[PDB]
Write a protein that holds these residues in place. Structure first.
Motif, short mmCIF file in Angstrom:
data_model
loop_
_atom_site.label_atom_id
_atom_site.label_comp_id
_atom_site.label_asym_id
_atom_site.label_seq_id
_atom_site.Cartn_x
_atom_site.Cartn_y
_atom_site.Cartn_z
N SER A 60 0.52 -1.13 -0.02
CA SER A 60 -0.13 0.02 -0.05
C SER A 60 1.01 1.10 0.57
CB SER A 60 -0.87 0.07 1.31
OG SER A 60 0.06 -0.60 2.18
N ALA A 61 1.61 2.13 0.45
CA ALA A 61 2.12 3.25 1.21
C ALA A 61 3.05 3.08 0.61
CB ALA A 61 2.40 3.48 2.82
N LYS A 62 3.91 1.78 0.37
CA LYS A 62 5.40 2.28 -0.52
C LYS A 62 5.29 0.50 -0.91
CE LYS A 62 6.21 5.68 0.52
NZ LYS A 62 6.20 7.67 -0.17
N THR A 63 6.34 0.71 -2.21
CA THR A 63 5.49 -0.14 -2.81
C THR A 63 6.12 0.35 -4.09
OG1 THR A 63 6.18 -2.02 -0.52
CG2 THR A 63 6.34 -2.72 -3.33
N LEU A 110 -5.27 12.92 -9.65
CA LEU A 110 -4.64 12.19 -9.59
C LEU A 110 -3.06 12.05 -9.00
CD1 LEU A 110 -5.73 10.24 -12.23
CD2 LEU A 110 -4.04 11.97 -13.63
N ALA A 111 -2.46 13.62 -8.88
CA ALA A 111 -1.55 13.47 -7.73
C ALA A 111 -2.04 13.23 -6.62
CB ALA A 111 -1.11 15.04 -7.25
N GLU A 112 -3.61 13.74 -6.01
CA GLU A 112 -4.19 13.24 -4.68
C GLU A 112 -4.56 11.92 -4.45
OE1 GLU A 112 -8.01 16.32 -5.07
OE2 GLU A 112 -5.72 17.09 -5.09
N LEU A 113 -4.88 11.42 -5.87
CA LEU A 113 -5.07 9.96 -5.50
C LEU A 113 -4.20 8.89 -4.85
CD1 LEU A 113 -7.17 8.93 -8.91
CD2 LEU A 113 -8.47 9.21 -5.78
N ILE A 114 -2.94 10.01 -5.91
CA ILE A 114 -1.46 8.52 -4.82
C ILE A 114 -1.73 8.77 -3.93
CG2 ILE A 114 0.37 8.82 -5.02
CD1 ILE A 114 0.60 9.73 -8.52
N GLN A 115 -1.25 10.15 -2.99
CA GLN A 115 -1.70 9.69 -1.94
C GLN A 115 -3.01 9.81 -0.74
OE1 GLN A 115 -2.81 14.37 -2.29
NE2 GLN A 115 -0.26 15.09 -2.17
N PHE A 116 -4.18 9.50 -1.30
CA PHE A 116 -4.76 8.21 -0.49
C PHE A 116 -4.28 7.27 -0.52
CE2 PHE A 116 -8.53 11.23 -2.06
CZ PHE A 116 -7.99 12.28 -1.72
N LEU A 117 -3.89 6.85 -1.61
CA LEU A 117 -3.35 5.39 -1.24
C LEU A 117 -2.29 5.43 -1.12
CD1 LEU A 117 -4.39 3.81 -5.40
CD2 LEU A 117 -5.27 3.37 -2.87
N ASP A 118 -0.89 6.07 -0.41
CA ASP A 118 0.20 5.89 0.03
C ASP A 118 -0.74 6.34 1.03
OD1 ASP A 118 2.28 6.26 0.80
OD2 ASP A 118 2.61 7.70 -0.93
N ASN A 119 -2.15 6.67 1.54
CA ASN A 119 -1.96 6.83 3.33
C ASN A 119 -3.22 5.52 3.92
OD1 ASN A 119 -2.88 10.24 3.18
ND2 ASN A 119 -0.94 9.47 4.03
N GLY A 120 -2.84 3.99 2.03
CA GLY A 120 -4.12 3.31 2.87
C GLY A 120 -5.30 2.99 2.07
N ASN A 121 -5.91 4.55 1.85
CA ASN A 121 -7.41 5.56 2.59
C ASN A 121 -8.09 5.51 1.34
OD1 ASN A 121 -8.72 7.43 4.91
ND2 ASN A 121 -10.31 6.85 2.68
#
Ligand SMILES: c1cnc2c(c1)ccc1cccnc12
Length: 160
Positions: A60-63, A110-121
């Protein structure tokens, strides 16, 4: 086309100078849409992995799927920056402004979606109205395409 295309070298060369800008402009826009769609796809496959859960180590956040998203998004704005650097042609200036509008919105999304998924949300991932913003830019880019196509058509003989 073939036969009697241009009145003179001045007329041919004039049509080259317009078509060669048009081309470059369009190359940049085409590569910006293309890397924004690869980013959406790479967010989609991340999120689907997320949702299979039980998971396997870090996902999720990383990888690296999300890192891929971060790269293609960061290549699309580079092409957009090359586009933004270029001389606005008079015939293209409405189209081009309408493009920046929806571009700005879909990049941010798109940038936001990356941060949601990096936060696992995952709820925020899905809460974002991503497709309306993707389509809007699609329609703006198809509107630019049409207007470039008309300007391009006026550069050689209107009779085949
Ligand atoms: C190389 C590439 N495109 C062109 C030319 C040469 C010459 C004329 C011209 C006119 C309209 C559009 N493109 C071209």
């Amino acid at each position: 086309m073939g036969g009697l295309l241009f009145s003179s070298l001045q007329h041919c060369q004039q049509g080259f100078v317009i078509s060669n800008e048009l081309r470059q402009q369009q190359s940049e826009l085409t590569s910006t849409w293309d890397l924004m769609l690869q980013t959406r796809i790479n967010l989609s496959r991340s999120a689907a992995r997320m949702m299979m859960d039980a998971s396997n180590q870090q996902s999720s956040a990383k990888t690296d799927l999300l890192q891929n998203a971060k790269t293609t998004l960061a290549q699309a704005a580079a092409h957009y920056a090359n586009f933004k650097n270029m001389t606005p042609l008079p015939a293209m200036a409405e189209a081009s402004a309408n493009v920046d509008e929806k571009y700005q919105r879909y990049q941010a999304a798109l940038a936001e979606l990356i941060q949601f998924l990096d936060n696992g949300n995952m709820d925020a991932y899905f809460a974002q109205p991503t497709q309306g913003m993707q389509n809007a830019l699609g329609e703006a880019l198809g509107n630019y395409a049409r207007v470039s196509e008309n300007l391009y058509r006026q550069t050689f003989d209107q009779s085949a």
